Amino acid sequence: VYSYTEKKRIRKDFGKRPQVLDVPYLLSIQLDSFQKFIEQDPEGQYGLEAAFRSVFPIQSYSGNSELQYVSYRLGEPVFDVQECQIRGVTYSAPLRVKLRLVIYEREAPEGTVKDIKEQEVYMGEIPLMTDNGTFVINGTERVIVSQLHRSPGVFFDSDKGKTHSSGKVLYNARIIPYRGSWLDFEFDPKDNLFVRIDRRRKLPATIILRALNYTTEQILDLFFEKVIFEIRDNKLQMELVPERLRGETASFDIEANGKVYVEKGRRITARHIRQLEKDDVKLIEVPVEYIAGKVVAKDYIDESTGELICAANMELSLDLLAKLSQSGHKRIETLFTNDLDHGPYISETLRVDPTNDRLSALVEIYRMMRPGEPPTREAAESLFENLFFSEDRYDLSAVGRMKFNRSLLREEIEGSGILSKDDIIDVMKKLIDIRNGKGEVDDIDHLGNRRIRSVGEMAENQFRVGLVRVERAVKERLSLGDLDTLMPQDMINAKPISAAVKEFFGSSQLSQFMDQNNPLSEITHKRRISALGPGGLTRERAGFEVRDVHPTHYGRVCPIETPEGPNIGLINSLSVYAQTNEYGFLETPYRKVTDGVVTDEIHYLSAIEEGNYVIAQANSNLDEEGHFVEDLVTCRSKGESSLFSRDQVDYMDVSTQQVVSVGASLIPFLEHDDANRALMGANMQRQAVPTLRADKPLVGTGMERAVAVDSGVTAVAKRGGVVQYVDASRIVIKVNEDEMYPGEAGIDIYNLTKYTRSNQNTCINQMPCVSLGEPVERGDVLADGPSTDLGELALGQNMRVAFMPWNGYNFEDSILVSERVVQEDRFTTIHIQELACVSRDTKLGPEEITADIPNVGEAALSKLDESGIVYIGAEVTGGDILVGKVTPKGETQLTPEEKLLRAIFGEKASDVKDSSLRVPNGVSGTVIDVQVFTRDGVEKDKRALEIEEMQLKQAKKDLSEELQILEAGLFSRIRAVLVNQLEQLAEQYDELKHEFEKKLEAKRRKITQGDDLAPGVLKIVKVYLAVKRRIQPGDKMAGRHGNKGVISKINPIEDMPYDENGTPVDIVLNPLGVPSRMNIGQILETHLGMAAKGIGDKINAMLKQQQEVAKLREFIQRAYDLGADVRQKVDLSTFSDEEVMRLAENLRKGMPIATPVFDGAKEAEIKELLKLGDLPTSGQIRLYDGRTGEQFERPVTVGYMYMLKLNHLVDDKMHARSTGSYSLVTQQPLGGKAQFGGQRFGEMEVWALEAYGAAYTLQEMLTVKSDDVNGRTKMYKNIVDGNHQMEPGMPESFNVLLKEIRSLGINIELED
Amino acid sequence: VPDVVQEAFIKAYRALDSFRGDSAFYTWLYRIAVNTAKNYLVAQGRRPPSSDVDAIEAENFESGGALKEISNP
Amino acid sequence: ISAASFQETTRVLTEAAVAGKRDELRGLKENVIVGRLIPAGTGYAYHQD
Amino acid sequence: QLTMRSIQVKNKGSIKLSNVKSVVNSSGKLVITS
Amino acid sequence: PPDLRPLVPLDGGRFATSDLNDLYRRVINRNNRLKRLLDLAAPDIIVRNEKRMLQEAVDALLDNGRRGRAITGSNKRPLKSLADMIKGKQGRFRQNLLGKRVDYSGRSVITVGPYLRLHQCGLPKKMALELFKPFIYGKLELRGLATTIKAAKKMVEREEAVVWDILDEVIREHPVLLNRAPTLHRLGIQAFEPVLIEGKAIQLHPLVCAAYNADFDGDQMAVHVPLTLEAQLEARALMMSTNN
Amino acid sequence: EFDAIKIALASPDMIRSWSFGEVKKPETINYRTFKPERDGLFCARIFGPVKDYECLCGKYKRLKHRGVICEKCGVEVTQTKVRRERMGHIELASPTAHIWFLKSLPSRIGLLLDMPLRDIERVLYFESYVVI
Amino acid sequence: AAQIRQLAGMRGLMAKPDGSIIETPITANFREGLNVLQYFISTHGARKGLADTALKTANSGYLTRRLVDVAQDLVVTEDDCGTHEGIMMTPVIEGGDV
DNA sequence: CTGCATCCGTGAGTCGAGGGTGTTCAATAATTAGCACTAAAAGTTCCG
DNA sequence: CGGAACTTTTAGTGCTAATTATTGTCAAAACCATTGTCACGGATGCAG
RNA sequence: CUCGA
Ligand SMILES: [Mg+2]
Ligand SMILES: [Zn+2]
Incomplete structure (x- = not known):
């Protein structure tokens, strides 16, 4: 099936690999995070409920007073989003929270409370967003960029290379929490273990283990093994297992059971281990010099004298051996030390520790923590138990505990929030085993070790920062508060909740205003993965590790989309199918593959689960019913490309466009492009200026239908039906009877936005695309915003492009443009500048907005009205006046021509200086809008009252239309009753009339009252200029394949080269940048545009001569059924024979052809498409000269190329100063x-x-x-x-x- | 911090004869310290801000009165 | 003057301050700092005169 | 334009040795003690 | 002096302030409290800590960042001391004495000109009007057209047809200095003779762009006016494109 | 016009010769009106008049009174360029050691007093003593 | 010649993030279509070359400033000195042929 | 008294464009910023 | 251009009332970030 | 903070 927005002009599609998963919502990450940030959720889930359950309840200093928490609520916004953008106030919402203050009775442990105080209180305000993820802070639109930081947990960095100028690698283990202090164990070039807490001085790591209530024998029992030495009748025999003697040479004769095994001076191999294990011997003969080199583990006290004979961490000698033999102790336990199994690292750290007790350990850790305030057994233990073990100042979350349990290879996945001693034992043991030679290290450039934070998780931290200050303030207020004096509303304050959230959302390193000139820029700026900001690295102090890309970024981080300049690779872009995990990671959907068939289902795999399974190739040729046509396949085992078979595969790629981002997927023939050229083209598509008349791209990618729809530049229909009233300002949509609501329903009103100013001074306009009587479905577009065409993104316009050198005018990369481009009103862009004039309150009198400007000519006063403000629709030149304003001459920095007159005969104080807002030199715009804001208590002129009267008339018309459609719905309802209740519906009619009159009174109160301004100003007059700029020699234009140039000199139509048919070319580029800068896909795009223009020319020739619908239907069927096995598969017989003429009218200007990113069309498809028309097969047509009119040898290639217009116009960088202003601190x-x-x-x-x-x-x-x-x-x-x-x-x-x-x-x- | 802390110490030393001895010295020094902190906050609220806008970012800016001068040859 | 415009300014300033150094501005950069004729191009003949 | 981060003899002529400190062996070769 | 550390009213609540003022106020306050503590017979450790605070304020005012900890006023950022106002890439030895902003200059986008000679380049009409104002004023005061300079300024601002032949007369043999914003070697600053071209961009010879190492993808270069007879003869004799 | 530049140390008598006033109050400017304080950081009798040929009080503004002081303020009325070269001084009650000769690495006071840098840092920060 | 070799013929051997040469080459050219992993290896190899100039021009400007600050304290002020010392010019014959 | 190694101070390009924020008790003793009242001197039309 | 009536003020006296900086403190009174940059010289302690 | 060189 096909929707109605595709039936007007269906796009021809190429490619062979069928998709299984649709394109998801591209702005769903920030919208999902903000929906998670503010939602009512029980059991302590995400949102504001976790912050409201962490801090609350709060109690006083054992005063039996508690402030409980029940729930919260959000108030309605007091203004519309357009009025919030005009007035400049924040788009906030009230935070209504209900609290409960209970206080217990005096001198009673179980006093039943009789004075309960439950009251809703108002604290601060939270900024809301629109339906696209754009916050309104102060007038403009600022979006919060997501930050990519390190995941909370544990890491094992390898300090190799030139570390410490020693030539020896190091191993350090760092524990990184979400909020709290940092723990860092680190090694020396020597064998001493040390620890550091928040980059302080170097102190040993065993002293914090002794501070955890552990004795030295427990330390040497936990970290080292136990070698047993028994006292025989002679020679002091020792137990043995043959596995421990690997790599050690025998310094004696190993013999047991009356038989020698290993001679003196022989090493033991694995076969010797097997031979000694087959004999099953335990006790050997060892000499007395072997025990004298070992260290005794535990302290052995004597039984005769009752004293200590051998201290711990001390080597044994012959006299101590005689003492331990004469005491009578048979069992002696020592340590095991070997450079291949267990290196000496605990004994040396114990012997370098000067404090062997707990109290001096607390004293030393308090000295290293806080220099000063000498305690007596109070502050040291409290600081040691508060720095690491309290839940308030240590905030290891669920993702931190999950990473800590995953990196330590344990079974459980959950746990507590505080740390424990056994976790410290296990991470020190993991450092010991990672030094010993088992396991591997974790690289810092791993996406499984990097977590991304969205706007909600970043705002919740600032909300908790404000909430702990609120908790401190209510603690200091409740510490002295008595009983039954006040309702709990003055216990809390608005500040510093609103101040902290305004500091977060208004001014930050990530809180930046977006560039609003391109829907591509609006959809790729919210999908930006920044590595800077708080809690990250700086862009000027980054090494060669972070800038390079790791092979774990396949499908999650775009490698070809990064800004060239100071930060390359630090600013990343999210992919198409990349989604945010529950913990905060990035997953990629994959197709589940069974043993025989590829099952068409999706499965989200994270970065840590990548190396376990195997992922097949995206464009692998497969047979029907899920079978590979070839036995050999390209795969990856663990981040490395290999060659595998058909039975080892378990997962498959879901699509071929998951590697590139949304901005890079619109470039056709991306696989025939260099990475540098595609990188420069992906950064130049974000700066395309919209023209006056948009034109569709001929060579698309199929992603053009998603960028225009999922962005906020178009008005998508929510409920389908028929369109009734099409106007330039509003669009009336009638809801069909099946999708209609069963009570109080009606029609939909869509108010389009007119010519207004954006952030980048780009005039955004919305134009209707439907007619009267045309039916629409759900999801269909209604209006086209900037750079759009019938629900499809269209950045630039297509033009005829030839590749030949023309008299040096295309010398390096320059572009030649004919006069037909500027004569057809093609590249004319509209810019809107904002000029504001403020009348501040100064000394010796306030300023006025009077029209009696002294010492000015009457020709300059010809544009002002009786008030003093220029009209709406009067053209001005650079240097003219716009609004009149006088000055009481109290200000300094006067001109010397006035300073000389004031020095001779001046200072009267009656005269007023000419300090008025004027047009800057160079710009010539038309005044289209005048906005006047006035403080309360200041009189207004007649033009401002006319402005408020016009606004009141427009609001009255809008509310009258709303009343009319509501009364029409109510009349339809009271007609539906007649198929004691009509009294009730008449009461509802009167209540709706009273609610309308109350809303009209509220709108009158909103319009007539004044707005807040700066402290010490009277009124602000804003004049909007609308300058129309065209093309000229000096601007910058570029295509999509990363080729940019400067237009040199405009040329007439008769001077351009022309073919044998008579059509002149419009753009003459340079074909010399093609072999060096390797972007060969532009010639393929030019040939595809030439074939599409040939099909469009055949369509226009078939249409212009009157032809029956049968031949046109047959030609469109022959054009759409090309023998390439495409995924379109359309038939023209299923149409209703009425929209086929509309399809021919939409295809008479060209043929939009879709070409995928990595499944693009081969050369044979372009050859048969050129063979379908009357165009030559080679693609090169002969052209004649323009001036001389001869015939060119070696005929050039011509066609249509999609080229954009950059935001680098020559009327914005040109500047020239003879003599101007000078600084005063330096001349x-x-x-x-x-x-x-x-x-x-x-x-x-x-x-x-x-x-x-x-x-x-x-x-x-x-x-x-x-x-x-x-x-x-x-x-x-x-x-x-x-x-x-x-x-x-x-x-x-x-x-x-x-x-x-x-x-x-x-x-x-x-x-x- | 040390200017207002030492000023609180001076005002505690110069008013020690009025200590009636109903409590300890710590609550007295606590109340003196919080009162001197709030008095310094009030005096800072009367003063202009010290680090609001940098002077190098003031000449190349709109409505500069004494940073730039209208003096041409 | 040629060392104060380069890095390590305070150390060479304390070296030239406690010694009573008197440099005769015979160079290229220290005449750009003062703002007079350089003794390299056309101003070299002025310096010889 | 820069970046940041016993062999055969083709010609036919005579052989010259500077700073000669050498003796001859019995196999007909030449060995150098320098 | 107060003209080097200005404190000015800025329109609205905002104020424009130098860094040193707060350190000077702290030094003056600590010196006044130190003069008041010694008269009231204070104990030794109070005036000792006052002397320590005054020494900390003094060596933070002289060079902030050389003490045990660099003090801050706001924004978690160290204040700019007198030693920090000299060092760095923002001091006087790098920003306001070696490379300074100059008058009689311009900036426009380059354009390939294949019909101009090697010793000349293009120049726009508005840039030639704005760069050579005093030559036009002197040639109008020489002729019998404008008595005072106000009438000549109004005739230049009105853009009549009597200024154009004066502009063609004063840029007959008056070379200008062209300048690229990155300048590696000596061939980035050359002299060229301007011609009047219609547009808003500077035309350049294609053969001289190999010495500039600047392609035509949107590069901007600067122009300069010599304004002196010795500078004009210097640009004719050594900085010319035919001589280099 | 001028020959070689001489740089040396600054004597306190030379600072007293450079001075044209004594700053005594830490009040910089008034909030309500932007007139400078009487003897603060921004002044008129120490540095000069704010406006060109106009005193701070407003009594003398003509060209006949150009170059005379007032009755209470005492400001020589002149142009605004005088406030760029004139300086002041602060009479410190306690002597202050310089930081450019103390922590230069190598230092100048430590080499002259044949004493390491840590001992002078302990003496100047009042945690250790020194005998004379 | 090498860029037209990579254009018409195969690109040959590429680089790895460790710094050495990967043992698996790219068997495609620019005229015929590219695989996804080959383009991934190509953009990894091109990102380092793009960041090289951006991380190198700062050190180049610093080296130019240092060599300017060391030089320029010399003026050619005399015509002849009348000396007899110098150096002997020899061709570069060590290493390669010439 | 001849070396070991551990930190502490220096730095890390240039030219343009847009957009810019600070954590409060009560009650007073002096103290100066408006503001009424004259001041005819100074300023502004008008008749010969 | 020479005169008196007409009219509008910038300077001097006051005077009350918001801006200034002061007095009190007397149950007790659990405290900022840092932490993901690299590479030189040379003055320092151990520590034999 | 960001964009082009
Ligand atoms: Mg360039
Ligand atoms: Zn005065």
Whole structure:
């Protein structure tokens, strides 16, 4: 089946691999996160309920007073989103929370409470979003970018390379929580183990284990093994297992049971281990020098004298051996030390620890934690139990416990939030085993070890930060509060909830306003994966590890879409089918493959589960009923491409477009492009300026129907039916009888948005696409926004492109454009600038907006009205006035021509200076809108009252239309009654009339009242200019294959090259950038556009001569049934023979052909498509010269190429300043195009002039033209008098440096 | 911090004869410290901000009164 | 002056401050700093004169 | 333009050795003690 | 001096402030409290801690970041001391003495010109009007057209047809200096003779762009005016494109 | 015009010769009106007048009174360029050691006093003593 | 020549994230279509070359500033000195042929 | 008294465009910012 | 252009009333980030 | 914070 928006102009599709999964919602991640952020959920789930259950209930300092929590509620927004964008107030909502304050009786443990106080209280405000994920903070639209940070858990970094200039690798284990202090174990180049907490001084790791109530014998029992030494009658025999003697040479004769086995000086191999295990011997003969090199594990106390003979962590000698033999202790347990099995790391750390007790351990860890405040057994233990074990200051979440249990290879997946001692034992044992030579290390560039946080999880942290301050404030208020004095509403305050959420949503490193000029930019800016911001690395201090891409990014992170410049690879883009996990990871859907058939189902696999299974190739050729046609297949085992068979596979790719992002999937023939060219083309499609008349792309990818629909630039119909009233402002949709609501239903009203200003000064416009009587279905579009065409994205326009050098005008990369492009009104863009004029309240009198401007000509006052504001629809030039404003002459920084008059005869205070808002030089726009905001208590003029009267009339018309459709629905209902109740419906009619009059009174109160402004201003007048810019020599244009150039010089139609038919070409590019910059897909796109233009020319020739519908239907059937086994498979006989003429009218300008990203069309399909028309098979047509009119040898290739217009116009970078403003702290010119500031002579340019001679040129550029106070005025006087003669003088910024050095204790003086 | 902490210490040393001895020294020093902190907050609210807008980002900006001068040759 | 415009400014400033150093501005960068004729191009003949 | 991060003799002539400290063996070769 | 650390009213609630002012206020407050503590017969440790605070304020004002901990005022960022106002890429030795902003300059997008000679380049009409204002003023005061400079300024601003032959007269043999914003070697700054071209972009010779190492994908370069007779003869003699 | 530049240390008598006033109050500017304080950081009798040829009080504004002081303020009325080169001084009651000669690595006070840097840091921060 | 070799013929051997050469080549050219994993290896090999210039131009500018600050303290002020010392110019004959 | 190794201070390109935020008790002793009242001096039309 | 009536103010006296900076404190009174950059010289302690 | 070189 096909919907109605595809029946008007169906797109021809290519490709052979059938899809199984549809395109999901591309803005579903941020919408799902914000729906998860604010929702009523029991049992302590995600949202605000977790923050409301973590902090609450709060109690006082053992005062038997508690503040409970029940539920919360959200209030209605006080304004519409368009009025919120106009007025500049935040798009917030009230946070109505119901609380309960219970207080117990005095001098009673179980006092039954008789004074309960439940009251809803209002605290702060939370900013809401629209239906596209755009917050409105202050006027504009700011979107929050998701942050990619490290997942909470444990890591094992390998400090190899040039670490510590030792040439030996290191191993450190770091425990990273979600919120709290950090734990870091680390090794030396030596064999000493150390620990550090939040980058403090180096202290041993065993002292925090002794602080966890552990003795030294327990330490040496937990970390090391137990070698048993028994006291025989002689020689002090020892037990033995043959596995422990691997790699050690025998220093004695190993013999047992009256038989020798290993001679003195022989190493033991595995066959010797098997031979000694087959004899089953345990006790051997060992000499006395072997025990004298070992260390005794536990402390052995004597039984005769009652003293200690051998201390712990001490090596044994012969006298201690005689003492332990004469005491009578048979069992002696030592340690096991071998460089291949267990290296010495616990004994040396114990012997370097100077404190062998717990109290001095607490004293030392308090000294290393907080220098100062010497405690006596109080602050040290409390700090040690509060730094690591309290749930308030340690916030290991479920994802952190999951990663900690996964990286430690355990069975359970859940647990507690606080840490434990056994986890520290297990991570120290894991560090020991990862040093010993078992297991592997975890790389930091792994997507399974990186977690992404959305807007809701980032806002919940700021909400908890505000809530703990609210908890502290209510604690300090409840500490002194008595009983039965106040309802609990003054216990809490609005600040700092609203202040913290405004600091989060308004000004942050991730809270940035989006660029609103392209629906592609609106759909790829929300799907942005940033690595900067709080809790991450900086872009100027990143190494070569993070910028490179890992093979775990297949399907989750786009590798070809990254910005070139300072941060390459740090700013990533989400893929098409990439989804957010429950814990916070990224998964990819895959097709489940059984032993014989590929089952058409989806399964989400994360990055940690990638290396376990195997994923087949996306474009592998398969047979019907789920069978591979070949035995060999390309797969990946663990991040490495290999060659496997047909029985080892278990998973398959779901689509071929899951690797590229949404911005890179629109480029046709992407597999024939270089990664640099596709990277530069994916970053140039985000800056396309919309034109005045949009045109559809000829070579699409099929993804064009999703970007225009799932974005917020179009108006999608919610309920299908018939369209009744089509207007340029509103669109009336009539709901069909089956989808109609059974009570109080009607028709839908869709209000389009008119010409308004966006963030990037791009005029966004919405135009209707349906007619009267046309039926629409659910999901069909109703209006086309910016860069759209009938529910399909259309960034630029197609033009005729030839590849030949033309007199050097396409020298490096330049583009030649004929006059037919500028004559057909093609590349004309509309820009809207905002000019505001504020009348601030100053001293000696307030400013006025009167029209009596003194000392100005009458020709400048010809545009002002009786009020003083320019009209709506009056054209202005650069330098004219727009609104009149006077100044009471109290301000400083006057002109010298007024300063001389004020010095001679001035200061009367009656005169007013001309400080009015004027048009900048260069722009010539038309005033289309004037907005006037007025503070309360300030009188208004007649034009402002006319503006509010027009707004009141428009609101009255809208509310009258709403009342009319509501009364029509109610009249249909009261007609449906007649198929004591009509009194009830008449009462509802009167109640609806009273509700309408109350809503009209509320709208009158909203319109007539004043708005809030800055402290100390009267009124703000905003004038909207609408400048129309066209093409000219100097702009920048580029295609989709990463080829950019500057338009050189406009050319007439008669000077262009033309073929034998007479049609002139419009664009003459350069074919010399094709072999070096390897983008060969542009020639294939040009050939496909030429074939589509040939089919369109045949369609237009068949239409222009009058033809029956049978031949047109046969030609469209022959064009759509091309022998390529495409997935379209359409027939023209199922049509109703009425929309076929509309299809021919929509296909008379061209044929939109779809081409997939990696399943694109072969060359034979383009050859048969060119053979279908009258075009030549090779694709090269002969062209004649324009000027001389001869015949060109080696005929060039011509066709249609989709080219865009960049946001780099030449009327925005051109600037020239003779003499302008100067700074006061340093006598130097300013810099910028807004202010009158020139360019900046760089530091390397001074060295470039020093490489030449030019002492006079460098001296005049630095001193005369830039720095001298009395040198530039004399030079200006001498130039106009006819005397090219300068004076050196002295610079002033050197005097600023002299005063800066002289301000210190260093004297510097200029001598004679 | 140390200016208002030492000012609270001076105001505690200069008013120690009024201590009637109904409580300990810690609650007295606590109330003196919170009162001096709130008095410093009030005095800072009367003062202009110290680090609001940088001066290098003020010349290249709209409505600069004394950073830029209208003085042409 | 040629070392103060480069890195390690405070150490060379304390070296030139306690010694009473008097440099005769005979160079290229320290004449750009003062803002006079460079003794390399056309101003070299002025320095010789 | 830069980046950041016993053999046969083709020509036919005479052989020259600088700083000669060498003796001859019995097999007909030449060995160098330097 | 207060003209080097300005404190000015900015329209609205915002204020524009230098960093040093807060450190100066803290030093003055600590010196006043140290002068008031010594007269009232304070104990030794109170005036000792006051002297320690004054020494901390002094060596934070002289060079912040060299003490045991760099103090901050707001934004979790260290304040800019007098030593930090000299060092770095924002001090006087890198921003306002070596490379400074110059007057009589411009900036536009490059354009290939294949019909111009090797010793000349293109120049737009509005840029040639704005760059050479005082030459037009002097040539109008020389002729019998404008008595004062106000009438000449109004004639330039009105854009009549009598300024154009003056503009063709003053840019006959007046070369300008072209400048690329990255400048690696000495061939990035050359001299060219301007011609009046219709448009808003600078035309350039195709053969000289091999020395500039700048393609035509949207690169912007700067122009300069010599304004001096010695500078004009210097650009004619050594910085010319035919000489290099 | 001028020859070689001489750089040396600054004597306190040279700072007193450079000074044109004594700053005594930490009040910088008034919030309600932007007139400077009487003897604060921003002043008129120490540095100069704010406006061109206009005093702070407003009594003398003509060209006949150009170059004379008032009765209470005492400001020589002149242009606004005077407030760029004139400086002031602060009479510190306690001597302060410099930080550029103390932590230069190598230092200048520590080499002169044949004493390491840690001992002078302990003496100046009042945690250790030194005898004379 | 090498870029037209990669265009018409196969691209040959590529690089790995460790720095060495992967033992599996790319058996495709730019005229015929590309596999997904081959394009993934190609964009991994191209991202390092794109980041190389962006991480190298800062060190190039720093080296240029250092070599300027070391130099430029010399002026050619004399015509002849009348000395007898110098160096002997020899061709580069060590290593390769010439 | 001759070396070991551990930190502490330096730095890490240039030229343009858009958009910009700060955690409060009560009651007063002086204290200065408006503001009424004259001031005819100074300013502004008008008749010969 | 020379005169008196007419009219509008920038300077001097006050005076009350919001801006200034002060006094009190007397049950007790569990506390900021950092933490994902690299690479040199050379003055420092151990620590034999 | 970001964009082009
Ligand atoms: Mg370029
Ligand atoms: Zn005065």
